[PDB]
Paper text:
Autophosphorylation of the tyrosine-rich C-terminus of Wzc results in disassembly of the octamer into multiply phosphorylated monomers. We propose that the cycling between phosphorylated monomer and dephosphorylated octamer regulates glycan polymerization and translocation.
Previous work showed that mutation of K540 in the Walker box abrogated Wzc phosphorylation. In contrast to phosphorylated and enzymatically-dephosphorylated protein, purified non-phosphorylated WzcK540M was homogeneous, oligomeric (based on molecular mass in gel filtration) and yielded discrete octameric particles in negatively-stained EM images. A cryo-EM structure of WzcK540M at 2.85 Å resolution was determined with C1 symmetry. However, C8 symmetry breaks down for part of the periplasmic region, so local C1 refinement was used to complete the structure. In contrast to motifs 1 and 2, motif 3 (268–402) is not well ordered in the C8-averaged map and working in C1 identified three discrete structural arrangements. We designate the three possible arrangements as class i, ii and iii. Class i is a four coiled-coil helical bundle (α8–α11), composed of two helical pairs (α8–α11 and α9–α10). Only a portion of α8 and α11 could be traced in class ii (chains B, C, G and H), where the helical axes are arranged approximately parallel to the eightfold axis. We were unable to identify any density for motif 3 in chain E (class iii).
Author numbering:
A (entry chain F): 17 to 64, 85 to 297, 304 to 477, 494 to 721
B (entry chain E): 17 to 64, 85 to 261, 406 to 477, 494 to 721
C (entry chain G): 17 to 64, 85 to 279, 385 to 477, 494 to 721
């Protein structure tokens, strides 16, 4: 294989190569154009080391505060039905609608796997909306909170067009922290420098900068409260309060044990109230810390008392629901409320003490936020250019390996040179005609008819010095074009003023009678089986000039009909009335009929098909003919197509030029 | 070997490759599903060092204190009989039951080997239960402690369904400490920061988080009773199991199946010696006259399915023989296998049928006096076969029987003689052949293989033509050459061979540009 | 391949090589002379560290203060329609006009299509100007501010000619910071040393030096402020702690803190203020031109190598003679409706045809008859050029020559010689013409010609008529030589039919277009039909140095006349 061989193969398979490469680049383009853009924000913090601070910034303790303030456990996803709907909606300029949820508590299934309860919210207008957790339809209004079926929800500032759907998940706080931490990054950048470069990635550029601002200010306020915690009374207050709360918890546990020694609604409302109590206590502590380190008119503090009022309304409604349920389960619910609230307050105060102790013994003093978080408006992902480039290169490599496989795995004949190497005489290379009448008659100026006329002139020289004027033409495999070749050869040799008889001795799949118009009664079968004479089986082709004998009816014993002496009688009789007899015969690698017939033919030619037959196939056919005493004069390569690989591997494509005056 | 040979061999064994690969992938997927998911918890600890903190955290002091606190010496395993029961029970969705045991004293059997006493608890309801250590049945109740048979046992809050069994082991404290130490790891993420990352793996996500919190607090209390260690992050469990790593398990299954399939394919390719194409025989200088294909099919195939592909190949053989057998001494054709079960009587009988339908009188002699079954095949008046004629107790006219779906006369072997080789040496055999060479146009003789017995060599001296029958894959080229040289050495010339039982192969096509199987040719109606 | 072969290939392809290299170099000079020059200013900062100061200089705080000070959110670009108008305007010596904007407030639509609002200002004179945002024209004057259509604008000191347009964009402050940070670079020349090199690039040499001085001064002020903030905090605490020896001690401490606060100069030193390098750093014109030259050369050599290795055509007669094909002539390209042998008898191609004539006289003896059939391998191989001119050169020697045009499909010898086109060869073959009605005299010729006639529907079957052989047998006694012109044998079979009656047959192979295997296939197809091709005529030979270095001869031939 040389350079010209490879260039010819590429030129030939250019259609496959172009199609595959274009498909791969199309996939790369649609990926780069439909994948969700990922933006990046970064801040700069100055530290008065910084490896403990890099590890403490990425801790669940610092991040968990950011999930708590920013409600990052409420995941809202605009609902696009396909895996591509979001991207194509972005392309068409539809602004991604967003809704603001300040309080969400789902019925909290906690099954085996789905630890993240989910609901679907459908937008009806700028004010009201529909919800459906598990088919249970609910109607809510922005503002007025919803407490229905163990679902608490407050949607504010809905900013989507009607009909927009949203999947709302209450993913667990630890999952929220994991998601935040996976996209968050902290680096000193100097190793000595107090310069910390915080980065955060995400699909919403406005939200990731809020998250990173929250993180930066959480860490800032932690280190600031470190300075004032040394003389603060909070340490002693907690050290005194924790034993009291622990004693109350132990008393509640003892009371629960004494009373013990499962109503669905009772347990559900118990969980509702416990969650409300956790949120209220955490909000009280957050309000205290904010009022210490921030102002009342600060928007955060405003959000704080608004959330507190919301939680108070929810707790009042829950208490009203409790008052309506029978006292027998009310007693158990009150005991469970006391125990669970004691446990929750104990855990929260333990976390408070832990945070205070961690803050107090920090060697770092003044920390200052140099650059507040700002989002680069150019997404860091997807990297469209490299994506499309890899798509092009991958398409090219795939096309090249497919072409290489199809070049190394092909065995069919590529040129008459392959046949003539084995010592097989090729008498014509008939090209593919793009075109029931004979081609040599419907289109006498066709290219394949010109090749067949060349075959006629070559045969007039070959067939001289033969036993008789009988020419048997046999395929190597079925669908080799054997009957096309033989019929159009009869058509061309007929117009030269010769009497041609075309016998169709394919008594198995012969269809020359249909192709010439059929008086199918009394074919070759009927003559061979003795129920017809020669004169009643010969018909005349309308557009021909040659007579033809059809196969007749398919007999059960074609090979045994052909061995009859009647066949040789017919051939000896016809060889005196006709200038040439051409016989249509089945392939020799399929049946043996051609081997029987070729004993009576003075010339025998195989028809090879261009790519569909192998050189070894042609040699096996010629040797199987020889083994039966039939000598094959040569071959007729059929169905040749123009190929540059022929023109560079050999010097000639063997396809043939078109030659007429264009008008 | 080239690319085409490799791809053809792969295509030929595509069923074997696919089956082996799919078995390996099935095993990998079954493992990835049935392997118990092992979770991971982690905690963050600050030091103000971190080299001795690791060695003290993994010490038996802290770990043993944790085990004493959480009663980690009481092992409980829900009982599923096979090594697959737990995995599939998890897969269907049954919540795994757990019973809370707080006080357990087994009698401390402490025999030669089994230092870990164990019992089986059977849950009968939410309330009571049964115990069997070595068949000793006990009945117990949640709450009320049990002190019977050297067994002290205290179960609280049975959480399961009745019928569940639980293996309860009281393993020694050092064994528990080693078990904890094996899944507990301490690392320093920054390698210079004060932070320590504590990790614990286990199958129960809640239990391991409790254990790691207890480890953290035992270390904290040990330090305080001083250099202030502080717990930054308490232990929380990653809900995604860290093992089994399903994707890599399945990928390794696929890749290993592919490798095993490929190595077996190359072993089979380099370890097969049989004939693969007629070209192999024709290289040696042997004339192959037909390559008979496998027929998917007591009637003769050339009669029950005359349009079969093998019958077409046999017709091709008939036309080859009409040309090879001229200029022969007589109309006697001896067909001999190379090895037993070379499909040789199949060929000779169907060849007799196809030569008979052409209006010729064919006589099929079954001169396999050792294992000949032509009489069985054709139906039979089994008396007076060839042996009886040879041993002198029959006339030529009494042994010939006409095949019904035939057209050719035949002579059965007769009774299996004790001296098959010495009967055939009788001049009566040559007299029979000389007589039949006038009343019949063709005589086909069935003979045993020459590499088994010498009978074919005796018979073939009186046969004008002799053809060997090879099986496609079973016989080797050297077997055919050895058979023909043994025929020559005894004065018999084998005209050529008939390759039999050819199957379609892509390796043949790519190695030799023809597969040699033959095309089907009919108009479908 | 060897040195001689590659040298010959480059010599032959020198026109392609030079043209490709010239196109690449014109692209290179166009890019180098039209790309906007980029100047670089540098300043030197010394620290008495050096790791955090680098990140502080490139921070949005320092850069944002710079942008607020210099109003870098207002971007002003002179308007040129193409990507080359600015470059050519610079080449023509047109000094780039500038306007000075001090206050801009666009409506700030901030829609998805356009995040940053933009207007276009057209200068009408030295004082007044016009503005269009999206087609709404507003007139304004320097001085008097414009507050209309939610658009406020204050333009000062228009230095431009009337008709100049400026795209004026209001950049979001963060986008201005991004642009400033992209071009601004801080480096440490010592990698440890307190010396910091500040560089800034841009197309305005004065503007970048102003911006870099602004950055350096903001950084210096911030640095000295840090020393002053601590000192002022201590002084403020002392002052708030003021309530008699302690009173005097605190007064002395207050004075010390005052003098330490005012003495601000500290950790940062601005050694070199920013000055612009007058030589633009980009585009690096000379290396760009060098890359252009080398790239053109490499592309040319690669294309030449591909064309050399992918050409299969005939290159010398020796290629044909390797197989054993007799080449009786190699006819060069004639630079030129009359015949070449008659219009230009002294042509080089006619001299080659005369050599062919003398070779043919020897080749055609011991032939069956005086019939010479000339066939091609391909159409457009120059069959009829050679046939007609050979007939002319053999007719001037005083021999009776009959030229038959047996190409019944595309024969045009009648259109060449001028024609009484009625009664050609087809009409004689079709049975509707006599032998004597079809022979015509060539005017500037000397030989008879038989035109093909009307194109028949069956050219190959007409030639099979015994009338054709009768015509040949009759003409073989009224003429000294019959030259027959046929279609190519790889197209049709007519030449193979006619060659049964010709004593000599010659193939014409076009020099570059045909292949050696093509000629071999043609001759073997002739033999298969019982026609023996005596040899070949290579036609259309061109002069090539690759042939002279590969083979020992070019085979094109010398001119030979005494020049006067």
């Amino acid at each position: 294989i040389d350079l010209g061989r490879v260039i010819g193969e590429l030129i030939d398979h250019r259609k496959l190569i172009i199609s595959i490469t274009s498909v791969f680049t199309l996939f790369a383009i649609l990926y780069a154009l439909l994948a969700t853009p990922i933006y990046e924000t970064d801040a700069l913090i100055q530290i008065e080391q910084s490896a403990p601070e890099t590890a403490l910034l990425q801790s669940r303790m610092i991040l968990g505060k950011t999930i708590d303030d920013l409600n990052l456990q409420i995941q809202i996803e605009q609902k696009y039905f396909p895996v591509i709907g979001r991207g194509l909606a972005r392309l068409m300029g539809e602004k991604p609608g967003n809704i603001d949820i300040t309080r969400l508590y789902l019925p909290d299934s906690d099954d085996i796997s789905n630890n993240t309860p989910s609901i679907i919210l459908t937008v009806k207008d700028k004010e009201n909306y529909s919800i459906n957790s598990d088919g249970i339809q609910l109607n809510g209004v922005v503002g007025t909170l919803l407490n229905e079926k163990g679902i608490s929800l407050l949607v504010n500032e809905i900013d989507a067009k009607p009909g927009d759907q949203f999947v709302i998940t209450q993913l667990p706080r630890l999952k929220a922290i994991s998601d935040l931490l996976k996209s968050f990054s902290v680096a000193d950048l100097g190793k000595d420098t107090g310069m910390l470069t915080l980065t955060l990635t995400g699909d919403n550029p406005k939200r990731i900068s809020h998250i990173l601002d929250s993180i930066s200010q959480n860490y800032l306020a932690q280190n600031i409260a470190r300075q004032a915690a040394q003389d603060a009374k909070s340490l002693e207050f907690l050290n005194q309060q924790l034993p009291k709360v622990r004693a109350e918890l132990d008393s509640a546990e003892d009371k629960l044990n004494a009373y013990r020694k499962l109503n669905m609604e009772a347990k559900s409302v118990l969980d509702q109230i416990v969650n409300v109590d956790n949120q209220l206590n955490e909000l009280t502590f957050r309000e205290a810390e904010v009022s210490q380190l921030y102002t009342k008119e600060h928007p955060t503090y405003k959000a704080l008392m608004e959330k507190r009022q919301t939680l108070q309304e929810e707790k009042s409604k829950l208490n009203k629901r409790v008052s309506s349920m029978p006292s027998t389960q009310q007693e158990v619910l009150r005991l469970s409320r006391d125990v669970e609230s004691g446990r929750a307050v104990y855990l929260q105060l333990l976390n408070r003490q832990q945070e205070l102790n961690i803050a107090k013994s920090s060697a770092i003093g003044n920390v200052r936020i140099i650059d507040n978080a700002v989002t680069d408006p150019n997404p860091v992902r997807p990297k469209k250019t490299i994506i499309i480039v890899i798509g092009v290169v991958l398409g090219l490599i795939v096309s090249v390996v497919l072409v290489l496989f199809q070049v190394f795995l092909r065995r069919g004949i590529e040129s008459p040179e392959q046949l003539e190497e084995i010592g097989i005489n090729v008498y014509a290379s008939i090209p593919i005609s793009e075109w029931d009448t004979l081609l040599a008659v419907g289109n006498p100026a066709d290219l394949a008819v010109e090749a067949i006329r060349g075959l006629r002139t070559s045969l007039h020289f070959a067939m001289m010095e033969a036993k008789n004027n009988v020419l048997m033409i046999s395929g190597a495999s079925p669908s080799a074009g054997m009957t096309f070749i033989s019929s159009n050869l009869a058509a061309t040799i007929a117009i030269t003023g010769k009497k041609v008889l075309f016998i169709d001795a394919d008594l198995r799949k012969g269809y020359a009678h249909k192709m010439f118009g059929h008086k199918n009664d009394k074919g070759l079968s009927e003559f061979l089986s003795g129920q017809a004479a020669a004169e009643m089986i010969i018909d005349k082709v309308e557009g021909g000039g040659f007579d033809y004998i059809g196969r007749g009816q398919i007999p059960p014993n074609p090979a045994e009909l052909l061995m009859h002496p009647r066949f040789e009688q017919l051939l000896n009789w016809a060889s005196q009335n006709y200038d040439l007899i051409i016989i249509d015969t089945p392939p020799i690698l399929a049946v043996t009929d051609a081997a029987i017939i070729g004993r009576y033919a003075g010339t025998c030619l195989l028809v090879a098909r261009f790519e569909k037959n192998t050189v070894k196939e042609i040699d096996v056919s010629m040797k199987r003919f020889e083994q039966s005493g039939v000598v094959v004069k040569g071959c007729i390569l059929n169905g040749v197509v123009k190929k540059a690989s022929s023109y560079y591997r050999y010097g000639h494509n063997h396809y043939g030029y078109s030659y007429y005056d264009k008008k």
